[PDB]
Amino acid sequence: SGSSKNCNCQGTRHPVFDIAPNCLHCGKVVCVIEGLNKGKCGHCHEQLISDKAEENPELLAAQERLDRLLYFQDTSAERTKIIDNASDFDMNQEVGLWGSARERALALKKQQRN
Amino acid sequence: LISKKRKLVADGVFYAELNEFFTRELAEEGYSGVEVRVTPTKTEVIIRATRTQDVLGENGRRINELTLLVQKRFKYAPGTIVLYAERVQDRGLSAVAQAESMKFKLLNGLAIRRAAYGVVRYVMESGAKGCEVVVSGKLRAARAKAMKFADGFLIHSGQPVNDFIDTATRHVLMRQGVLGIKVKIMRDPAKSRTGPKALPDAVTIIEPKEEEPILAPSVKDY
Amino acid sequence: DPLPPQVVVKVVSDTWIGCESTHAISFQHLIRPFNETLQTKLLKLRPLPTSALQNPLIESIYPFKYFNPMQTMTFYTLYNTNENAFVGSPTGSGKTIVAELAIWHAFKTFPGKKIVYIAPMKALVRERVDDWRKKITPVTGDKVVELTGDSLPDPKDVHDATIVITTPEKFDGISRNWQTRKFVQDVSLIIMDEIHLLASDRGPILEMIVSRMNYISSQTKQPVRLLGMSTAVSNAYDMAGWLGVKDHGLYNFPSSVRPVPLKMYIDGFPDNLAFCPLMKTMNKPVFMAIKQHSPDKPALIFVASRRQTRLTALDLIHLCGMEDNPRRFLNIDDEEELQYYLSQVTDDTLKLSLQFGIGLHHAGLVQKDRSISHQLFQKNKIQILIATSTLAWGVNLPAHLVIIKGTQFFDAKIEGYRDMDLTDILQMMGRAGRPAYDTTGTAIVYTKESKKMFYKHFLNVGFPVESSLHKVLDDHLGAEITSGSITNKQEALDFLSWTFLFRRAHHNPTYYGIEDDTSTAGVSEHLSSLIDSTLEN
Amino acid sequence: IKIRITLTSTKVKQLENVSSNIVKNAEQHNLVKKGPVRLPTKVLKISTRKTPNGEGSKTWETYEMRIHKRYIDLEAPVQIVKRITQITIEPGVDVEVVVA
Amino acid sequence: MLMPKEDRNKIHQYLFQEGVVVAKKDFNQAKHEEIDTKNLYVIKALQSLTSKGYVKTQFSWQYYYYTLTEEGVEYLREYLNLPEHIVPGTYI
RNA sequence: ACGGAAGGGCACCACCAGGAGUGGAGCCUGCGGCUUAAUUUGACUCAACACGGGGAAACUCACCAGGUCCAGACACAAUAA
RNA sequence: UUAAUUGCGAUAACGAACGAGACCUUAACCUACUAAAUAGUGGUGCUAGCAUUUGCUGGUUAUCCACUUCUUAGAGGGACUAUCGGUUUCAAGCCGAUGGAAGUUUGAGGCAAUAACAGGUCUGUGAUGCCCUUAGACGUUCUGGGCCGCACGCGCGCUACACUGACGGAGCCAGCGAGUCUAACCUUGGCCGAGAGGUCUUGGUAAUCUUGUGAAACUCCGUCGUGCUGGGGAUAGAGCAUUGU
Ligand SMILES: [Zn+2]
Ligand SMILES: [Zn+2]
């Protein structure tokens, strides 16, 4: 957009620019506002967006656990649970299976067979 | 895009609806007025009563439905209104709460003088400067007649009346007619905790400090 | 996570019907310090691997090409900017790599400086030098000189030193002479680890140092860069509000997200045995837990006290007899090497314990014996690393299982046993998990049921860092003021105005003893009373 | 930025408290501003016959409300603005914020 | 009321998920809030149903607030033919 | 409490010295009366009569001559896919 | 004596309480505090006319600077009948002069005790006991009338009966208040029409647009002339428009 407003928030108060999140020369994080207003890096004025075996083996191997690391924090809701030895863990998905007792009517039926 | 001259009266109109709404819904719990607190991105309404648990309901079922009930008609976005419940203090010194005792005590068959005498003793026992109970209607006779019960002293004219005296009016509906109940409570000015500490027509003179004459010059140095 | 409308406290009669007594409690005093700031992880996927640093000398070392995402919002913010930032990473998640950001921050702008590292314990001091003496000096030409209570090097070496590691107690003495110590003139950046220990014994010493640079930075009109390493800190706003850090640059993640996952188990134990009988009930579960949770992988146990170090080995070895391999997990197939290794063992418990694959460690042994119990673990000769809670600060033991052997530690001040604080066990949880060796880590928190419900609520969450300097306030008040800085009592109020206690006293009046008024004005005279109470003493 | 905030509450006593803190925060933020411009207080009058029926001497009563408007102009980056809106919240006082 | 029952169905199920409904005392405005049919059918569909202790009414400035009962919602459940303990109006 | 008893006090909803008037004419408006199907009705000394905030073409409307609708919830019994 | 059992006093009473007063709102003073392009002023720039000799009258928002006298305020002070002189057991007080922004409870209101009316209202109320009606219902709704109907009696008012006027031109001044969002409110300005009014945009949710609401009585010039006249516009006829089905 050509705006001269250098938003140096580094994504603190704005979402990051998904296409170009960070600078490759000085590591500054470019937010969404910092993205469209200028295609050049704010700090070092380096180009921000250019106009498996081939890649470096560590780089594609690097991002594997970043996806896991984001997965860890995304799926951290159940990671905070405590196992303990006094929890029911009721074997129930979300309900008592419609509150009806006929699936265990075979238990005494088996006892009848016994 | 609403005129401020209309926006502000709207709040008074808005405040007027809840007061009637709650006093017709939570009266049996001893409804003691409402407070409206607006905040950016969410507005909160505080409800005060004695039987807050009955106001709350089991797991706040009544509180949850009251919010939604206010939510649907008052046309707010979801999550913008939250209703709280808290115990009203100084239950003796509360005109709206105390007047409901008349409404309860009259409906069960209790006599008039004893019921009014019970309240005036109760309010005075709660550290009140004065009380006033007025009952009007058809009282055990065809002719209407109004009794008045008072204790202590009260003021009747001027701004301090609007500050130290709170008035409550309740209509009692019996099978013979409608009875009117009026309660006036004179709170202690010293325990006001806000504004005036005493009536404007009273003056306090500090006691002089007595010191004997020196009768001889003396000099004190460093 | 969803804020409740209120908090309801219910009381019911167990025998009578309808005897209900309940109260609803609201909360409106939600203030900005009363808020976990935290930071969510956002997509900055592409890192700056090694080559994006523009220094061949640095790129010639640190063969790490993987650039840590766990420093994403940090990255190069501290590399170029000259503003304070708070970076907290538990376990081995940047103790080495982040500690070198001081060289990258400003050392290239002005080289040949004496930027000082500060370590809260001498155990941290030894490792901060041994590893980095062959990593920084051979390439950067910068020598590392130790400044502790046991080492007193020549001042010329200290002045010409570049990497200086000093304990806060020893750093206080140098800072006690800050007016005339010509050595301390080149401080541009200070790097610290284990910040959250303000509540510890060295915390008042640690806290008073940080406040000293604040006046130095303010009076001299140039900033003194500060960097602190710690664990997840609940009161991050006061952490930001007192350290003078800016918005750009910050690092605080919860214990849920780590490079290695951690699994916590809670075990309550009865409230009848005072301290003596409550090891016999729980020692047997400890043995099976090692077999249950660490089949063929290293474990680690931490006894309560010195005597518990011995008794644990006595029973565990005894219980080890009733199973297949008496010398279980000895990992020494060569008998000739076994006798050579057992030759160096000196006496007592270590003599008859090392054969069982169980290691013992306590502060009653020869210095080389402690290394022997750890050198074998480096080769995974012995799995059990039974020790006392002092080792939770020292060498990074690559263990997987960490069992909290009991709770409550004896205090001579109260002539009794007082419970653990949530600053040691939180760090104790960091020992579990072996980097690049196993996927996840496990730990158990053997304790009483009475504190079980409490800990289950807060072990994952934790508590804010507090300050307890007003127990030894007389000693460390004269650290900066006895030089003749302030002569009037009016400025004494401003003296603590830049301290962490001033931040927390208004925020937490109840913790600091204030019970009359919760307003900021009410704290003022109480703070003045603390100022007053010192001078008559 | 030239951010603008206005106060249109009905009770003066809290209004001064809201204005007093806002102005003292700004000066210790060291921000350029213009002082609180106190707009004239508009009085809303409603005259009505006292009696509900038509009987009796013709007596009229005039109820009133007072409306007081204070607005203060500020100029500062966005970071200071957001926390200002987050603080100084008082009952019966509504504050609207506008930029440029 | 002589009119098709599918209108009863949606308004009754609408009363089910939240449990609270309001309706103006304005006969023949032909529009009710967030309900496709008109008021007179909606408004009179409840005090024909308040009778057997099912739902409540509040006059309160002729605005006709309505709230249901614990047995009333269960009574409404067989009308909707859904499993028990599935979705209450004040469910946790 | 009352008095078709006597003192003393006050008051431009009493007078005094005056000013402006009204009452005299046209018109507006309200009430009574007449009339009508209805000319809806309350108030009749101060303390009713440009008062019911009542300056009504439809609504308001309460009256008259007419035409529709049922909003009788609910229960019981009845007809009955 | 006071507006006031407002207060003096002679006293078998002293000391008090409610009502009055006190109190609250508003109008008067501040070249004092804090201020303020939505309020002004002065100066500085551009710019028009007259005089030109240094000026006067204007206009101008990015042409800038300063202040708060007038303007809006928030916090305060100020009057308590002040001082003096008269009259009074020389007490409450009253009168005159001086000063004062204010000296008739500073002017005006809000509230306003014990008690009484068999005062008015069920036609304000989803306030109401009882009675009455409840399905060709006195309920509700649609059409058309009436509430305005006139030989009359009264009550509050608007016009006026003329030169202190009537009429035509010009002079040209206020305050209280209000105004549109899912609508069509208050309207400037341009054009058309005598007028009513119509038309297109404009500004305004309002100290910033209507609005300086250029209101009227009034001031100055002219016409009329003591003639129920150019006073007064009742009762009427025709025509042109507005609102609303
Ligand atoms: Zn940004
Ligand atoms: Zn860059």
UniProtKB/Swiss-Prot annotation, chain A:
> Which GO CC terms are listed, alphabetically?
cytoplasm; cytosolic ribosome; mitochondrion; nucleus; RQC-trigger complex
Q: What is its main location?
A: cytoplasm
Asked if the keyword ATP-binding belongs to this entry, the reply reads no
One GO term of the biological process aspect: ribosome-associated ubiquitin-dependent protein catabolic process
Q: What happens when the gene is disrupted?
A: Defective activation of the ribosome quality control (RQC) pathway. Mildly defective ribosome stalling induced by RNA arrest sequences. Sensitive to anisomycin (stalls ribosomes in the rotated state).
A GO MF term: K63-linked polyubiquitin modification-dependent protein binding
Instruction: Give the UniProt subcellular location, in the record's own words.
Output: Cytoplasm, Cytosol
Keyword Nucleotidyltransferase included in the entry's annotation: no
What further note is attached to this protein's record?
A: Present with 1710 molecules/cell in log phase SD medium.
Q: How does it assemble?
A: Component of the RQT (ribosome quality control trigger) complex, composed of SLH1, CUE3, and RQT4. Interacts with SLH1. Interacts with CUE3. Interacts with HEL2. Associates with translating ribosomes.
Please give the function described in this protein's UniProt entry.
Component of the RQC trigger (RQT) complex, a multiprotein complex involved in the ribosome quality control (RQC), a pathway that takes place when a ribosome has stalled during translation. Specifically recognizes and binds RPS20/uS10 ubiquitinated by HEL2, promoting recruitment of the RQT (ribosome quality control trigger) complex on stalled ribosomes, followed by disassembly of stalled ribosomes.
- The protein's name: RQC trigger complex subunit RQT4
Q: Supply the gene name.
A: RQT4
From Swiss-Prot, chain C:
Q: Which GO terms describe its cellular component?
A: cytoplasm; cytoplasmic stress granule; cytosolic ribosome
Q: Where is the Helicase C-terminal domain?
A: 282-477
Q: What happens when the gene is disrupted?
A: Defective activation of the ribosome quality control (RQC) pathway. Mildly defective ribosome stalling induced by RNA arrest sequences. Sensitive to anisomycin (stalls ribosomes in the rotated state).
Please provide, alphabetically and separated by semicolons, the GO molecular function terms listed in this UniProt record: ATP binding; ATP hydrolysis activity; helicase activity; mRNA binding; RNA helicase activity
The keyword Nucleotide-binding appears for this protein: yes
User: Which residues does the UniProt record annotate as the domain Helicase ATP-binding?
Assistant: 76-251
A biological process term (GO) from this entry: cytoplasmic translation
Keyword entries, A-Z: Antiviral defense, ATP-binding, Cytoplasm, Helicase, Hydrolase, Nucleotide-binding, Repeat
- The residues the record assigns to binding ATP are S89, P90, T91, G92, S93, G94, K95, T96
> Which segment of this protein is annotated as the motif DEAH box?
193-196
User: Coiled-coil stretches, from where to where?
Assistant: none
- Tell me the compartments it is located in: Cytoplasm, Cytosol
Chloroplast in keyword set: no
Q: How does it assemble?
A: Component of the RQT (ribosome quality control trigger) complex, composed of SLH1, CUE3, and RQT4. Interacts with CUE3. Interacts with RQT4. Interacts with HEL2. Associates with translating ribosomes.
User: What function does the entry list?
Assistant: Involved in activation of the ribosome quality control (RQC) pathway, a pathway that degrades nascent peptide chains during problematic translation. Drives the splitting of stalled ribosomes that are polyubiquitinated in a HEL2-dependent manner, as part of the ribosome quality control trigger (RQT) complex. Also represses the translation of non-poly(A) mRNAs together with SKI2. May block translation by inhibiting translation initiation factor 5B (FUN12) action on mRNAs lacking a 3' poly(A) structure.
Family that this chain belongs to: Belongs to the helicase family. SKI2 subfamily.
Q: What else is known?
A: Present with 486 molecules/cell in log phase SD medium.
Please identify the protein, giving its name as recorded: RQC trigger complex helicase SLH1
Print the organism lineage.
Answer: Eukaryota, Fungi, Dikarya, Ascomycota, Saccharomycotina
Curated annotation (Swiss-Prot), chain E:
Report the GO terms under cellular component: cytosol; cytosolic small ribosomal subunit
**Pfam annotation, one family:** S10_plectin
| Major site of localization recorded for this protein | cytoplasm
Q: What else is known?
A: Present with 54100 molecules/cell in log phase SD medium.
Q: Which GO terms describe its molecular function?
A: RNA binding; structural constituent of ribosome
Q: Superkingdom of the source?
A: Eukaryota
What is one process in the GO biological process aspect for this record? cytoplasmic translation
> Post-translational modification, briefly?
The N-terminus is not modified.
- Provide the protein name: Small ribosomal subunit protein eS10A
Q: Which UniProt keywords are listed?
A: Cytoplasm, Ribonucleoprotein, Ribosomal protein
**What does the UniProt record say this protein does?**
Component of the ribosome, a large ribonucleoprotein complex responsible for the synthesis of proteins in the cell. The small ribosomal subunit (SSU) binds messenger RNAs (mRNAs) and translates the encoded message by selecting cognate aminoacyl-transfer RNA (tRNA) molecules. The large subunit (LSU) contains the ribosomal catalytic site termed the peptidyl transferase center (PTC), which catalyzes the formation of peptide bonds, thereby polymerizing the amino acids delivered by tRNAs into a polypeptide chain.
Q: Which family does it belong to?
A: Belongs to the eukaryotic ribosomal protein eS10 family.
Which locations, inside or outside the cell, does it occupy?
Cytoplasm
Subunit organization = Component of the small ribosomal subunit (SSU). Mature yeast ribosomes consist of a small (40S) and a large (60S) subunit. The 40S small subunit contains 1 molecule of ribosomal RNA (18S rRNA) and 33 different proteins (encoded by 57 genes). The large 60S subunit contains 3 rRNA molecules (25S, 5.8S and 5S rRNA) and 46 different proteins (encoded by 81 genes). eS10 interacts with GCN1 (via middle region); this interaction is direct and promotes GCN2 kinase activity.
